[model samples]
Target: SGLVPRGSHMQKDFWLSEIGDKNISLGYYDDNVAIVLTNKTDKILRVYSYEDGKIRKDFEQKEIITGLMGDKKIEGDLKTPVGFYELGRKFNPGDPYYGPFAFATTYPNLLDKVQGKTGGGIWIHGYPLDGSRLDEFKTRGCIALFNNNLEKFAQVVQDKKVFVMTEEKEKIRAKKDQIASLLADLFTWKLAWTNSDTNTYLSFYDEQEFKRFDKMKFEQFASMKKSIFSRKEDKKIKFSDINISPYPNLENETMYRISFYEDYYTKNYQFRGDAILYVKIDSKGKMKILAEQ
Candidate 1:
């Protein structure tokens, strides 16, 4: 039955972070279409679905190839990157090498930069008609599929799509459950921050994490936040239209990326913008901030 389970913690009103009468899908905002590319024995299985959390079968697929070794490192490493990536602009490679359509992936992203990885032109494209080496795990670095398959999935790969290339089998049920658990903890962290719970808020982060601020600066920032939270008796804090997405394809298996539009206002000040966060699990299997930008 496609129904919310009884006594589900997600049944709480706060779990529904977005504004309006809707349920959190895949622990993300509604109307979000995300794609996952699972690197299999010799093919890439593509799963596309709205972020409404329900796990669905009958996903589509095509053939593709990766690097000779695995997990890209430096430029010309001849290794396909294994991390979370965003599909970028679309174009044709002009020659017969890249088929009819080729799209870019936001490689060398935050994770890559942090790890000092360097490489570019990681794309999902089609194989040549008369070209040889059409087998899987044979590309220089990019993902390759047949012409017809690429044509079929071209429109499916559009804006606001995240592509995770991992050895994981792309299980929907597990992913859905992971998102639910993540949202559960994330809401607790946000609420602590909003309610001026300094100790609770600071606890979400590691004193040595140092993603946004160095250790000393982080302490200073924490102190500032404590001061700000208590300065005014009546301050408004709210988060709306929050979206959480799995940030797989990183160096580790415990991190996930979160994005949301935040709203905060007080009698003396107002601040608003999109927030991008990368969270990781601690040794105790708890969520901790890896980076925020």
Candidate 2:
């Protein structure tokens, strides 16, 4: 298990009180395309497009049905999960009951696992073509749209790492200043790493909270970095297509998931791939890395 900080209410109140409408951003997909599903009274599914770090509502489908109204916790719960997920593995189901198109969702993501949530086969899919199912029927933990709407949805999204956010209420919008400050902190960490400033770079991480994808502890990770930094070889690191979004479903804590395409090169090694970091603000208001990949 990993450490989950119980952030102070004072910090939460500080950010919530500074809200504004113009520079709106969603916690799940602030800077990328997103499909949002609301499980409340309206039962709506909406698509939003991102332009210049701002989001604009594109279109919506009404009368969409989801699993029974609750957060999914275990297998066969028949409840839809409420959080951020990436759409994965597009496919055409051979069974007409699944309609024309379907795509899996990365349910039980890292946070889900950290919280011990379980299950699989969550998807965004089309209605049954055989008419055996009602037009407004709940799914076995999947999002169901009319066949026609599903077709249009596929055409518009088109496989671009589009994020899916399921919510039980209206989406929250974060102030622009909050996002900008987080980005600034992130770049500072990047600069420290690129310049081989070992102490500065290591300070950005939480020694007790940090974990790597391979299950490496913070001490091990820091030791490895120290060895690499000692080389002092010329280095080049670049990040593109960066995404910064609040970590969903944490009421009292301020957390974010930062992901981007990273290109790093040195005399002995080179790496080009996706990088992800989970960060949280400490009592001193400094953003510290909690996990990374």
Candidate 3:
């Protein structure tokens, strides 16, 4: 099945590099919250908080655990997934099995689908209605925490936030820094776009991997852009609420999703819309547009 074996370590298809200390994109810590659950177990679940320019270990509990196996990709794999996901709304109260609270997730998201992985009903939940505790490797596939600890974890994330499930914790700091740097490139790309610097705008993308518009088609489009820019003056473009993160299911490569609100204006026309880019890092340490939507 090429399935990740049980009671062992598995490399995540994505989330490869380490992260860093300070991140301006994270909004000074107080306004930002995220979680990283390592599969090394030690039978522990840790909740991390950021405040005053630091990542605070807000809470820790050893009474819960995840799947007995590694890297779940199919239905009934009985293994927890490894990657980045957004914590969804808490399950309705009085839920029969998910005690205290259960966070829904965007599992099998875009990257998951690209890799042909399949699974659903993944969640961060607590013990059952019987008050029974699930030991390490006990739950079917969900990340399970103790009943008493669920609410405390819930507090750190009052709303939908980034949740990471991975095998390496020490490297995340470097990874965070990497993502932050790439965000700057996204901004630069935006500037070239609105400033009518078509060739400069094209530089940010990999002519080889950027296939949305084939070579000839792209040239034709570029010619069109040249004409448009020739008529415009003092074009101004701005980006806001930029969100950047590594995609979780990118096996064999590093890819990231950068999304943000974009606004553009010129003497003759203006518009506002959301821009998203899926970027790939090649062997030469260059970042290029793998896709955009």
Candidate 4:
């Protein structure tokens, strides 16, 4: 069996060291492609590997152009937004001006909204094939690469989508100890929920800053969870393929995004799907869930 014996040396070492990435240091997970866009003097795009903790050299693309130097603030600012985002829709046979393909990015993410940042429709795309556009260092706000390179990039990332981090200068690596602590807190929260410990489970959520995917506020989410806990039904819950990454482009605060495949079983219902949680450390230094999906 692949499972290590509990309380053994191997298990202890694995738990203490192997739970997070030391090189990439963003978080630990096998799925999803990680892309880093450096918008400083170099203006290059690189694909990073979470498993190997290095950049994929074959996927590197240079001579990229973004908007004017700065974080996007308004609809017509002409500045590429900088932060962690998930790739959204794919557009094939896109307009000739944008080359062959384009991929949308989920800009104005949770932190963006919190900071009152505006604007949207930022995408990773290619340049015009007709050679009409002359400026090599100009863009409305999108990241533009050469057509050939963009095509290859699309093929490589089409299957798994991507998690993109746009930075002003250098790549930002997360703290390993912070990541390990969040992982431990995740398990503690999971155990509480599995045992239907209402108070303990609810305590893990931030009362002032909690929201559900469906736009339910903290009070509403608490009431619904309380009712479910009252059922007291035996349950089985499991999580696999877990990922935890720090949210980027924020100042004076630490936040993380945690995602996993969840399998749940109960007498009346059984379900399996993906789950995500956004958490932050409170003043008391406890990790508390801020949002869930």
lDDT of 4 by residue, 1-293 (tens): 13555422213244446643346465566564565444544788876655444445447776778766667777878778876777765686457777777888888676566445678878888878787672434566888878778767876666664787777565566666666667667767777788888888999888876765434477787888899999888888887777777665434456677878889999889999988777886666567887665
Among the numbered candidates, top TM-score falls to: 4
In model 3, the clashing pairs are: 18-171, 18-174, 18-175, 19-172, 19-173, 19-174, 19-175, 19-176, 20-173, 20-174
Q: What are the Cα lDDT values of the candidates?
A: 0.61, 0.69, 0.60, 0.69
Which scores better on TM-score, 1 or 3? 1
lDDT of 4 at 2: 32
TM-score of model 2 vs. true structure: 0.74
List the candidate numbers ranked by TM-score, top first: 4, 2, 1, 3
Off by over 4 Å in 4: 1-14, 20-22, 38-42, 52-55, 61-63, 68-79, 88-90, 108-120, 132-140, 155-161, 168-171, 213-216, 283-285
Error of 2 at 271 (Å): 0.8
The lDDT of model 3 is 0.60
After superposition, the stretches of candidate 2 with alpha carbons farther than 4 Å from their true spots are 1-24, 27-42, 68-79, 88-90, 108-118, 130-138, 159-161, 168-170, 213-216
Please tell me which model should have the higher lDDT, number 1 or number 4.
4
Give the TM-score (vs. native) of candidate 1. 0.72
List clashing residue pairs in candidate 1: 25-51, 25-52, 25-53, 26-52, 26-53, 83-249
